[PDB]
């Protein structure tokens, strides 16, 4: 009935400049019908290869695209950091048309530690009734990161959330942010609001604080 | 290259909607339309086909007939219409036009539908502002707090797009409030705080709100 398309690996983590290669293999005979597209974080699809080795004339020609009998694939002869990706081949011999499950491109790159910004909540905010305490890990690799959050040296709980950012397409980093949230009431019962990060780049945990008192720069 | 659809799109579970998809320029040429489905993080999914020349259509059995494709030979523009709505339908509609000798040559941004009962909400937008607890050797980090929003998406811009560099915009988080929140920071040099004005452009269509918020020192 329906073509099954399975693709291989379902991630692929990679150095960068390495040779990669994507596998789709048809449960059917596709006759070279096969179609490569990539899809970019913000979601952007684009064509890549066609008709199994026809490259899209905007795509560089890094990539390639195969066929080994059932066996069709996408190669990047060189991995670059933009190339971090989403990645699914769409068979289109028949239909319905399918498409592979995927393949998440990731980039192996050095250890980079993050640069640590806090960011006290906003006078505008305050007169709203909450107060959204911003901590920033910028630019660091691997994602792998602790954050933790301390109102006058007492470890928070429950009261914060966090958000990271896919690998950066020029410098394949992560980003972090940590958000603590408090009522107002409580954001001005309290002092020092400090933002404890800790990662494989920093040999000691990065403390970064502010006084309430002090608005939150040096008064 | 890419083609024009609708914008995102809040509805409620067991009605119906439908967006639309059109090439850029009047290119009156016999296109035929794929439409594509995508939930949050997951796999692509065909949906069906239009083809406007004849008004032939092709739909994947698994959407059980609830999909239906029409189009407007005058203007060129596919509609797919989703009908009896749940939240499995709450997902990103790609559209792509192709031919036989130029099979998904382009494809449209994609349309955002949130099927929820919840209203729509236009976000707050509080600045993160730069000090000197946002700044690291000459680099200062700034941004804007763009909280409670529904449904998603709010799209953010710096400078009205004239800042693009060392931008990080967050995946919205969803609160316990039931309501969205991001975050967006771009990092530029300290020394242009005094002189460099920076504002952030957030729109959230589905509220039909606009703001530009300047971020100050
Ligand atoms: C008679 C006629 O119009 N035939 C015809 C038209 C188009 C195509 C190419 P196609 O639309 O099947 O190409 C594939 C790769 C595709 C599937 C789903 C979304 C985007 C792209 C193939 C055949």
């Known amino acids: 009935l329906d073509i099954q398309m399975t693709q291989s690996p379902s991630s692929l983590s990679a150095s960068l400049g390495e040779r990669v290669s994507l596998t789709c293999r048809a449960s059917?005979?596709?006759?070279?019908?096969l179609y490569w597209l990539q899809q970019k974080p913000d979601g952007t699809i684009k064509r890549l290869i066609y008709?199994?080795?026809t490259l899209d004339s905007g795509v560089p020609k890094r990539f390639s695209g195969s066929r080994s009998g059932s066996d069709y694939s996408l190669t990047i002869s060189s991995l670059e950091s933009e190339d971090f990706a989403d990645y699914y081949c769409?068979?289109?011999?028949?239909?319905?048309?399918?498409f592979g499950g995927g393949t998440k491109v990731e980039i192996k790159r050095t250890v980079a530690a993050p640069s640590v910004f806090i960011f006290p909540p906003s006078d505008e905010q305050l007169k709203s009734g909450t107060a959204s305490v911003v901590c920033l890990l910028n630019n660091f690799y691997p994602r792998e990161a602790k954050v933790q959050w301390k109102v006058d040296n007492a470890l928070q709980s429950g009261n914060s959330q966090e958000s990271v950012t896919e690998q950066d397409s020029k410098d394949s980093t992560y980003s972090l942010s940590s958000t603590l949230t408090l009522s107002k009431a409580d954001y001005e019962k309290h002092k020092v609001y400090a933002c404890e990060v800790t990662h494989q780049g920093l040999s000691s945990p990065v403390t970064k604080s502010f006084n309430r008192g002090e608005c939150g720069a040096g008064a | 290259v890419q083609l024009q659809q609708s914008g995102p799109v809040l509805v409620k579970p067991g009605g119906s909607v439908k967006m639309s998809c059109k090439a850029s320029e009047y290119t009156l040429t016999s296109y035929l339309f794929q439409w594509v489905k995508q939930k949050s993080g997951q796999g692509l999914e065909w949906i069906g086909y239009?083809?406007?020349?004849?008004?032939?259509?092709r739909y994947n059995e698994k959407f059980r007939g609830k999909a239906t494709l029409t189009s407007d030979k005058s203007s060129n523009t596919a509609y797919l219409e989703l009908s009896s709505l749940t939240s499995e339908d709450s997902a990103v509609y790609y559209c792509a036009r192709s031919s036989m000798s130029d099979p998904g040559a382009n494809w449209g941004p994609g349309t955002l539908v949130t099927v929820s009962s919840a209203s729509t909400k236009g976000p707050s937008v509080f600045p993160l502002a730069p000090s000197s607890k946002s700044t690291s050797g000459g680099t200062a980090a700034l941004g804007c707090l763009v909280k409670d929003y529904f449904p998603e998406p709010v799209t953010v811009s710096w400078n009205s797009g004239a800042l693009t560099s060392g931008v990080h915009t967050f995946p919205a988080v969803l609160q316990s409030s039931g309501l969205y929140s991001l975050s967006s920071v771009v990092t530029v040099p300290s020394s242009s705080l005094g002189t460099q004005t920076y504002i952030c452009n957030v729109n959230h269509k589905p509220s039909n709100t606009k703001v530009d918020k300047k971020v100050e020192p």
């Open positions: 008709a199994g080795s």
């Open positions: 239009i083809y406007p020349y004849n008004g032939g259509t």
């Open positions: 769409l068979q289109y011999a028949s239909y319905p048309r399918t």
């Open positions: 059917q005979e596709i006759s070279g019908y």
